[PDB]
Every structure is written in structure tokens, then in C-alpha cells.
Amino acid sequence: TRALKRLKVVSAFLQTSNSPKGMVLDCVPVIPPDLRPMVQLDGGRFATSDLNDLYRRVINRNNRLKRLLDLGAPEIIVNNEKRMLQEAVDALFDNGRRGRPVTGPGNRPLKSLSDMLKGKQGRFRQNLLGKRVDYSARSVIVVGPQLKLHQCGLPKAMALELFKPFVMKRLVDLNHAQNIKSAKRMVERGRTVVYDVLEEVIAEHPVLLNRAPTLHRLGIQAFEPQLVEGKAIQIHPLVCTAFNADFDGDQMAVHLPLSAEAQAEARILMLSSNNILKPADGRPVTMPT
């Protein structure tokens, strides 16, 4: 078995052209500066990323090693510098894989290269699978019984900020606003002309409602919007159990599909009237009790 495990690693080297010498790195690459920003902070302070500190140490220790090697120095002193240089590079690539980490200020471990690539908060699981999005909104939900199955109430102020590009384009075309900047000013002030234009543009344009845990695919469902005063999304009481939404207090996010293909999908695939039956067992879900 020892030979079996050992064979796995060593065979990979022979078949591949790449030589084993990549284990021992001679030159340390550096991250581009925008990816480790020394951003100015309001109030005259500064904000720096931890990679700068770790890169600073390896540069410092390498520089001193050149000085020690240049003049005649003993073996004890040069060995300690080579030992510290090796430790510094280790901290940069993976802080905490050997002994105590480089705490810096003492309150907290310094971040590291691999630390960005790991865990729930890592790049993979926080910025590549799931991102934040524009043209999106949020509000508490209330029950509206007079709605139809394919309808949801959208607050006036909420819808206005979602559909701001579309309102501006129509305002110019309908000549209520002269130019693009003048159209921008009109919607931000919230003049009376905007509300008439707004109801014209939202029609036949679905919006994707969504509740936070979203266990199963009926968590996201498109709806035909409809303006309503107040500040709470009206929702249809039949579709509550698909979202698992009660009305204690439950904020529901609102997304907007933009392109022609995307909004077509919300009308055909994701509509709330073509999702009567649970996909688990083909049982009705839109008749709560």
C-alpha cells in the first residue's frame, strides 16, 4: 500500500512533460496592485489589504539576506535569515499551516493568498457562484386576496427605482422631458408626470419574486406586476406555501428580467400559473388550507 500511494504521485510526473522542480520556487510572483488596494479612506485614514504586509515581509527578509551574503557572515546568522525567509513565504501562500500564524496587529490572523480561495466566504462560493445584482429590490409582503394567480402588487416607489432606464426612455419619446439628463432629474424629484408614464411601461413585463431560503425550484416565481400604493409587496394567498411565506414579517426580493430571451423565460417557464403541481410527487401545491 505504501508503494501504491507513492506510485500515484510519481507516475503523474513521468507521463506529464512538466518536471518535478516546480516544488522549489525561485521567484515569487506578486498580485497586481488593484487586487490589493491601498485605498484612501474618508477622514484622512487609510485602508490596506493584508497581502501588502505579507509581501512586505518577504521583500524585507530577502533584501537582508543579500546584505548578509555579501559581507562575510557566519553560518549561524545566515541560516537564521534563510529560515526566516522560508517562513515568510509560507505565511504568504497559506497562513497557519505551520505553527502560529503571523497575527500582525495581534487582534486577528492576517489574510493569505489561499484564504481568499477557501471556505464559504472564499472567491468560489461568494463571488463566482452567487453574486449581488443590479435591477433588484426588497420589501415586506402582505396578503392580497383580490389578485389573480398571475399577479402581484408592486409598490410605486419600488417599481420606479427598478424601471428607471425604461421610464427615462419613454419620457423623452413622449416629449415630457427634453433630454436624458432632464429626464433623470424629473424621476429623481418624483414629479407628477412620471407616474402616468410609469404605468404605461411596466405592463406585460414580468418580475421574479423570491424568498430567502429558496429550498426548491418553486422558490422563484415570475408574476405580472401591478402598481399599488403603500410600501409592501402584495402577494397572492394561494402561492404562499410554495414560497413557505407567512405574513408575520417576511421580506421578499424582487428581480427584473431585462433582455428579450430572459423575459420570455419568465412568461413561459417561470410563471406562477404554469406551476400548479409540486415536482416532487405531482401533488397540488397552490390550494393551501
Partner 1 sequence: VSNAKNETIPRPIKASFREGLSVLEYFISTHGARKGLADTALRTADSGYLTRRLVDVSQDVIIREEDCGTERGLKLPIATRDADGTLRKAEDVETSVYARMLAEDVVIDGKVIAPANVDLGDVLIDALVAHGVEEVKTRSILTCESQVGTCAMCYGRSLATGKLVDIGEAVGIIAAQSIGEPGTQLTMRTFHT
Partner 2 sequence: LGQRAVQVHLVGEVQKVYNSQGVSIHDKHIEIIIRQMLRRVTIIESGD
Partner 3 sequence: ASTAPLRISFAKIKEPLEVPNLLALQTESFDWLLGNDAWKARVESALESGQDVPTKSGLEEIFEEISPIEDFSGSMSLTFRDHRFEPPKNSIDECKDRDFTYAAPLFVTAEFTNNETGEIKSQTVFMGDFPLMTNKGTFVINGTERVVVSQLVRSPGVYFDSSIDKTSDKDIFSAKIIPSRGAWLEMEIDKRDMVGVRIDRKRKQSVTVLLKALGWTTEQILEEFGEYESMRATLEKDHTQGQDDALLDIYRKLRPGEPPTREAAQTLLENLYFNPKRYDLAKVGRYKVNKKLGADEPLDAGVLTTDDVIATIKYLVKLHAGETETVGESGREIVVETDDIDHFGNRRIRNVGELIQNQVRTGLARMERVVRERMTTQDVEAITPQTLINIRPVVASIKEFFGTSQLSQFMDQNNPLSGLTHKRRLNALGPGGLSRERAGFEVRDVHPSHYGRMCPIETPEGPNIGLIGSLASYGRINPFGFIETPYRKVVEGQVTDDVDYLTADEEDRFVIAQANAALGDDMRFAEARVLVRRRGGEVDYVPGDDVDYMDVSPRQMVSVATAMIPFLEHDDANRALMGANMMRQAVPLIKSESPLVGTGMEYRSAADAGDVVKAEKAGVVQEVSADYITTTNDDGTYITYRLAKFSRSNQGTSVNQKVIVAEGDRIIEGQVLADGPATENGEMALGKNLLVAFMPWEGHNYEDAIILSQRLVQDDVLSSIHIEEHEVDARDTKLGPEEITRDIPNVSEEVLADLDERGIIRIGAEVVAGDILVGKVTPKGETELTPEERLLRAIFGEKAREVRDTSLKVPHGEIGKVIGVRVFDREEGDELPPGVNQLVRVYVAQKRKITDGDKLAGRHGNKGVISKINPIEDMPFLEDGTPVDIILNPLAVPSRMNPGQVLEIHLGWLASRGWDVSGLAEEWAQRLQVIGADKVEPGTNVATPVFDGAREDELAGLLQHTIPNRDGERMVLPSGKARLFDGRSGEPFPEPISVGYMYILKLHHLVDDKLHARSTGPYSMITQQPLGGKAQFGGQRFGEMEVWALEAYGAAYALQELLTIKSDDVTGRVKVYEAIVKGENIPEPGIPESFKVLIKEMQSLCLNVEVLSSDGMSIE
> Which residue ranges are tagged as binding site for Mg(2+)?
246, 248, 250
Dihedral sign for Cα 76, 80, 85, 86, please. Answer: positive
Tally of CB atoms within 10 A around 239:
23
143 binds Mg ion (CB under 5 A): no
Residues of span 209-228 touching partner 2 by CB under 8 A: none
Q: Which residues inside 186-215 make contact with partner 3, applying CB under 8 A?
A: 188-190, 208, 210, 213-215
Q: Of residues 165-184, which lie at the interface with partner 3 (CB under 8 A)?
A: 165-166, 168-169, 172, 180
- Helix 164-173 crosses helix 192-202 at what angle (to 10 degrees)? 110
Sorted by sequence, the CB contacts under 8 Å of residue 178 that are 6+ apart come out as 172
**Residues 244-273, mask of contacts with partner 3 (x by CB under 8 A):** --xxxx-x-xxx-xxxxxx-xxx--xx---
287 beta partners: none
| Min separation Cβ 101 and partner 1, Å | 27
Site for partner 3 contains 225 (CB under 8 A):
no
**Of these partners, partner 3, partner 1, Mg ion, none, which one is at the site of residue 277 (CB under 5 to 8 Å by kind)?**
partner 1
Part of the chain binding Mg ion (CB under 5 A), chosen from 110-118, 172-180, 238-246, 258-266 = 238-246
Task: Please tell me whether residue 168 adopts helix, strand or coil conformation.
Answer: helix
Cβ neighbours of residue 120 under 8 Å, at least 6 residues apart? Answer: 126
* Cβ at position 235, least distance to partner 1 in Å: 20
* Cα 257 to Cα 207: distance, rounded to the nearest angstrom: 7
228 bridge partner residues: 155
Selected from 5, 283, 284, 287, the binder of partner 2 by CB under 8 A is 283
- Which of partner 2, Mg ion, partner 1, none interacts with 248 (beta carbon under 5 to 8 A by kind)? Mg ion
Given partner 1, partner 3, partner 2, none, residue 207, with its beta carbon under 5 to 8 Å by kind, binds none
Answer yes or no whether residue 246 interacts with Mg ion by CB under 5 A: yes
Q: How far is the CB of 122 from partner 3 (least distance, A)?
A: 10
Rounded distance between C-alpha atoms, residue 152 and residue 143, angstroms: 10
Instruction: Give the chain's radius of gyration (CA, Å).
Output: 30
CB 155 within 8 A of CB 232: yes
Cβ–Cβ under 8 Å, residues 157 and 231: yes
Mark the segment that binds partner 2 (CB under 8 A) among 166-174, 182-190, 228-236, 274-282.
274-282
Q: Which residue has the cell 430571451?
A: 261
Report if residue 279 touches partner 1, rule: CB under 8 A.
yes
Residues forming the site for partner 2 (CB under 8 A) = 280-283
Q: Enumerate binding residues for partner 1 (CB under 8 A).
A: 213, 215-217, 275, 277-282
